[PDB]
RNA sequence: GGCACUAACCUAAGACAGGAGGGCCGGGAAACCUGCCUAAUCCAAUGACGGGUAAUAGUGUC
């Protein structure tokens, strides 16, 4: 359990640099939390003893360019509000049981549609948000060991911002040919390499900001058919068949 | 192109409810730091502080 690491004046270096500077004189590796500047301070978190003592060591074996010492402090603490929100296995178990409900047997199609607001989420006082990488690991996992054989899925009205979190889908929904990605914050059609490997049929992209960045629909069509070249329908229309040979 | 910074912009479900200033207990020779208190005054749910990058300039870096 956790630790707070504070580096004085930390703010007036790379933060790349100074990590490795660190991590290099540490007889330990250390995957640093919430690294986030706070004045002049620079400021982390790491998960056990072991390890921040051994953050402790690199005090005088470390000097910045301007030939002075560059000083780590370290506290024990709560631990990170990214580690308090991921989700509790009693939580998880929860998490499976609504999916549940909300899968459709016949047409093998799971609707997380605005999941955060799911009525049995809120009696239980289970945040579930799908922009949180930990959210959205949990979910596939639950899809990965219940439903591998996933083909249509929605994730519309979500607020996602990225898709970086769904990266591994194309290998735990291997046959997921029906995807719904509408009303979220999707910034570009470059969110779609993440999840490229996917052999679509259906998709729906409208709501998302990306949508806009296109002087019309047949840029905004092909654009679309570079990752998912057997696309057939795109935000509920039918597309024009791909171009022969 | 990557990555970082200043700007711009996104974010309270892209980390976060207080931030600056001031003060307190503790540690320390000092520097400095964990935790806490606080309308002198400034900023802040019309989102400060922190975080982030799909898009735009400026700078470094590989």
């Given at each position: 359990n956790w630790f707070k690491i504070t580096i004085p004046?930390?703010?007036?270096?790379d933060k790349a640099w100074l990590l490795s500077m660190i991590q290099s004189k540490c007889s330990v590796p250390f995957t640093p939390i919430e690294f986030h500047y706070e004045n002049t301070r620079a400021q982390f978190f790491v998960e056990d003893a072991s390890t921040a003592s051994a953050l402790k060591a690199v005090n005088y074996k470390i000097l910045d360019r301007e030939n002075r010492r560059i000083s780590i402090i370290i506290n024990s603490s709560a631990p990170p509000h990214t580690i308090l929100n991921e989700l509790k296995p009693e939580q998880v178990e929860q998490l499976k049981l609504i999916m549940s409900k909300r899968y459709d047997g016949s047409q093998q199609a799971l609707d997380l549609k605005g999941?955060?607001?799911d009525p049995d989420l809120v009696a239980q006082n289970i945040d579930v948000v799908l922009n949180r990488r930990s959210c959205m690991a949990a979910t596939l996992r639950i899809i990965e060991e219940?439903?591998?054989?996933?083909l249509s899925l929605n994730l519309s009205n979500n607020r996602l911002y990225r898709l970086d979190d769904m990266s591994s889908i194309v290998q735990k929904?291997?046959?997921?040919?029906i995807l719904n990605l509408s009303g979220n914050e999707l910034k570009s059609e470059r969110e779609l390499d993440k999840i490229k490997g996917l052999k679509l049929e259906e998709l729906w992209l409208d709501?998302?900001?990306?949508?806009?960045?296109?002087?019309?629909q047949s840029t905004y069509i092909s654009a679309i058919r570079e990752r998912?070249?057997?696309?057939?329908?795109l935000d509920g229309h039918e597309l024009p068949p791909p171009i022969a040979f």
């Open positions: 004046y930390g703010r007036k270096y999941l955060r607001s219940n439903i591998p054989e996933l929904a291997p046959n997921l040919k709501g998302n900001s990306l949508c806009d960045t296109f002087r019309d998912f070249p057997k696309l057939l329908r």
